[PDB]
Amino acid sequence: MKYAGILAGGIPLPKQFLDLDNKPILIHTLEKFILINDFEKIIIATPQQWMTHTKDTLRKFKISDERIEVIQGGSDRNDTIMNIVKHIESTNGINDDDVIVTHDAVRPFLTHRIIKENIQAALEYGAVDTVIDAIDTIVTSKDNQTIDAIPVRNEMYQGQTPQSFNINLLKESYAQLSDEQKSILSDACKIIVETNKPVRLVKGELYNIKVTTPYDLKVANAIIRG
Amino acid sequence: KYAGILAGLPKQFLDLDNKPILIHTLEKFILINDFEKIIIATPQQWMTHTKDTLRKFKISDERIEVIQGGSDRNDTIMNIVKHIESTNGINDDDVIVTHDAVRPFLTHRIIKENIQAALEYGAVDTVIDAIDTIVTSKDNQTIDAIPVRNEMYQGQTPQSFNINLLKESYAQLSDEQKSILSDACKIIVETNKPVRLVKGELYNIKVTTPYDLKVANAIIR
């Protein structure tokens, strides 16, 4: 079975509640998932502080899909994903072949194609990162002052989301980490990488941006109209 | 201090809010008086159009000169410095701020900081902190590594240099080696000199694709 985990983080107002053509970013994102019947549940995890606001917002914009549930997020991105896993486990149990497609609420421009390919790659390979080829040259620095290296450009990618997993694999790898590894690891796919399992790449889109700044909001208002 | 604006219908003539990208870029350099010359290097076929475009948009600065570009980006940078050499000579402390014409959103701050860093350290890259997690891959299919997030930056332009240092570094390499390293700061790196960082802006994008042009019109509007 296939599940969606929508990560709706905190911060005056979290950016997923900003308006994009008179509809909050969160609603744009959710509408993309509602149109795929493959998902058994579509779970929005958000800090307690924003839970009622999330529920109210879904109602205001006539979201009525019976698969949507709003739950409390965790202490970091990965703890939030594991809260979603525990919610699925408590309500439906977990099957051998279950996959979860996790995705940032402030990325409203992912496509049907991206979601369906994430599901298929998660079933085939167990772990999936959505990335694009680096738009600008990647430059590395250990001191925030001088160049350390300029790596080979065709090997560099910028990560987006979704990030998708066989759920049992994600549980086993998260259990396989160190309290320090859990403690500093802020990427979900790094959980898999660091327990030395393969992570497949799904190519994103240049417009699959994260809306975090005013500049992003300007671009997002342009994207939403095309 | 010299400006070298690299101009490869070419994308720098595409309209951005009803004014070509090249003019947007040039206007930021014209408002910095430190520059002794502002040189636009572009292929022969585009020199008069370039000149005409500057006249059409009331660019009236005696420091602007349009010269013939080179066989690649690095050969064009060296065409610029050789033009500077033939016209004015080179002083010990001369710097050049090189910049892509299709990056119209650089700021006064960025240019001024590029000037200080070139005078202080000899070589400078304009970069921004990586907005997304950087992932590496050897097969274009599976992750190889996820490097440390705070060490990752995205390179933009300007890239600015003490001119004698750049002459010396380009002279000590192979032109085949030069072309396989087409980043100017990568060539300085490979000639064993340090490169200082100046922080750009998230909007200091290059306008190369139709999608980029849409984003650029969104930024400006």
Side-chain angles (χ1 to χ4, degrees), chain A residues 1-85 87-141 143-178 181-226, chain B residues 1-8 10 12-36 38-43 46-50 52-54 56-57 59-64 66-81 83-111 113-166 169-175 179-192 194-220:
Chain A
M1 305 300 288
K2 296 144 187 197
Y3 298 94
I6 301 309
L7 310 170
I11 323 175
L13 207 47
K15 297 300 184 162
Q16 69 267 26
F17 295 107
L18 289 189
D19 269 358
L20 214 53
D21 199 11
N22 305 303
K23 192 190 283 182
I25 290 173
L26 170 76
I27 301 304
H28 292 285
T29 303
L30 255 298
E31 287 183 337
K32 295 281 169 62
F33 284 83
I34 287 163
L35 288 157
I36 299 163
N37 188 60
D38 305 9
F39 288 120
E40 172 69 14
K41 296 162 101 82
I42 298 166
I43 297 152
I44 302 164
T46 195
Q48 190 59 224
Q49 170 167 7
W50 299 110
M51 272 179 69
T52 292
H53 203 247
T54 299
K55 287 154 158 202
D56 293 348
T57 298
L58 293 172
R59 229 146 42 223
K60 187 174 192 331
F61 292 88
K62 309 171 197 279
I63 298 317
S64 52
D65 197 289
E66 65 288 349
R67 302 170 294 167
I68 289 175
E69 289 148 45
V70 175
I71 70 163
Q72 181 187 277
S75 273
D76 49 75
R77 171 190 207 69
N78 291 328
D79 189 52
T80 291
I81 291 174
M82 300 309 293
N83 277 10
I84 299 173
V85 163
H87 180 76
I88 290 162
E89 185 142 31
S90 64
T91 63
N92 291 20
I94 288 160
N95 309 122
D96 280 352
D97 62 344
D98 284 354
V99 297
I100 181 169
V101 177
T102 72
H103 182 69
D104 298 317
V106 295
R107 285 186 199 265
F109 303 129
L110 89 171
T111 60
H112 176 269
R113 187 280 293 177
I114 284 173
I115 299 164
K116 302 290 296 226
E117 177 173 4
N118 261 257
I119 293 168
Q120 221 56 39
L123 294 168
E124 181 168 5
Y125 300 103
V128 183
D129 205 355
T130 308
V131 312
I132 50 168
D133 307 23
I135 294 166
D136 283 336
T137 298
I138 298 317
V139 183
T140 74
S141 174
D143 60 0
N144 203 44
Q145 310 292 345
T146 63
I147 298 194
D148 194 56
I150 308 189
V152 182
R153 198 175 179 304
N154 61 84
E155 300 182 354
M156 303 312 277
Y157 301 79
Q158 293 164 233
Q160 316 176 317
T161 70
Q163 301 179 313
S164 307
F165 312 96
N166 178 269
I167 291 188
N168 273 349
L169 177 45
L170 179 61
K171 285 171 62 69
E172 163 188 67
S173 305
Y174 198 77
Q176 264 172 359
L177 297 155
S178 82
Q181 258 172 322
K182 304 202 191 61
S183 186
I184 309 112
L185 267 297
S186 158
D187 188 84
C189 286
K190 218 173 166 163
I191 303 171
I192 309 304
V193 171
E194 294 247 3
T195 60
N196 260 283
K197 284 116 184 219
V199 179
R200 196 78 185 180
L201 298 193
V202 163
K203 294 308 180 63
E205 304 285 350
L206 301 175
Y207 46 81
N208 184 27
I209 64 166
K210 171 193 229 175
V211 183
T212 37
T213 64
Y215 154 70
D216 295 321
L217 191 61
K218 284 198 122 155
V219 181
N221 280 296
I223 294 166
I224 199 63
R225 278 125 176 125
Chain B
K1 297 127 213 190
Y2 298 88
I5 301 192
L6 288 92
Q12 66 264 29
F13 296 109
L14 292 203
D15 229 7
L16 172 52
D17 196 12
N18 304 298
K19 176 206 282 178
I21 296 164
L22 175 72
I23 298 297
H24 283 272
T25 306
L26 257 292
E27 280 175 329
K28 262 82 151 210
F29 284 81
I30 280 161
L31 302 142
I32 303 271
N33 35 48
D34 304 34
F35 288 125
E36 171 73 14
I38 302 170
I39 298 99
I40 321 313
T42 195
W46 297 120
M47 305 172 53
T48 284
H49 197 349
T50 305
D52 290 346
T53 297
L54 287 126
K56 164 173 190 25
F57 288 84
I59 291 318
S60 155
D61 201 298
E62 56 156 77
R63 305 172 302 174
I64 293 179
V66 171
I67 74 160
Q68 175 160 209
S71 210
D72 56 72
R73 167 200 208 71
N74 300 320
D75 196 359
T76 292
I77 289 173
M78 284 339 268
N79 275 9
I80 293 173
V81 48
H83 183 89
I84 303 158
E85 176 157 69
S86 317
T87 54
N88 297 22
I90 316 91
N91 314 326
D92 273 44
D93 53 353
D94 274 351
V95 299
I96 184 168
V97 176
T98 73
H99 185 71
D100 289 317
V102 288
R103 281 193 199 258
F105 297 131
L106 84 170
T107 62
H108 201 273
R109 179 194 63 78
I110 287 171
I111 292 167
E113 269 179 41
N114 261 262
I115 288 173
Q116 253 304 110
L119 295 174
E120 263 200 86
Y121 305 98
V124 47
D125 205 3
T126 301
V127 310
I128 59 159
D129 298 25
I131 85 189
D132 296 315
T133 294
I134 304 307
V135 163
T136 67
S137 175
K138 305 283 211 182
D139 60 9
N140 196 44
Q141 302 172 70
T142 63
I143 298 185
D144 189 55
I146 303 197
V148 196
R149 173 57 186 285
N150 82 285
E151 304 192 348
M152 303 314 274
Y153 302 81
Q154 298 160 25
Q156 322 181 311
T157 73
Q159 312 181 116
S160 296
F161 311 88
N162 175 273
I163 295 190
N164 284 336
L165 179 151
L166 178 55
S169 289
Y170 266 44
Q172 82 186 63
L173 281 160
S174 148
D175 66 78
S179 289
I180 317 274
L181 318 152
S182 178
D183 187 314
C185 290
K186 211 186 168 53
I187 292 179
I188 302 297
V189 157
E190 280 296 281
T191 58
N192 307 312
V195 177
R196 215 76 192 183
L197 299 185
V198 168
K199 295 312 185 66
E201 305 285 349
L202 289 158
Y203 46 81
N204 187 34
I205 65 168
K206 56 189 173 206
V207 191
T208 297
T209 69
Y211 174 72
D212 298 330
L213 193 61
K214 292 180 174 54
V215 176
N217 276 292
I219 300 163
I220 206 62

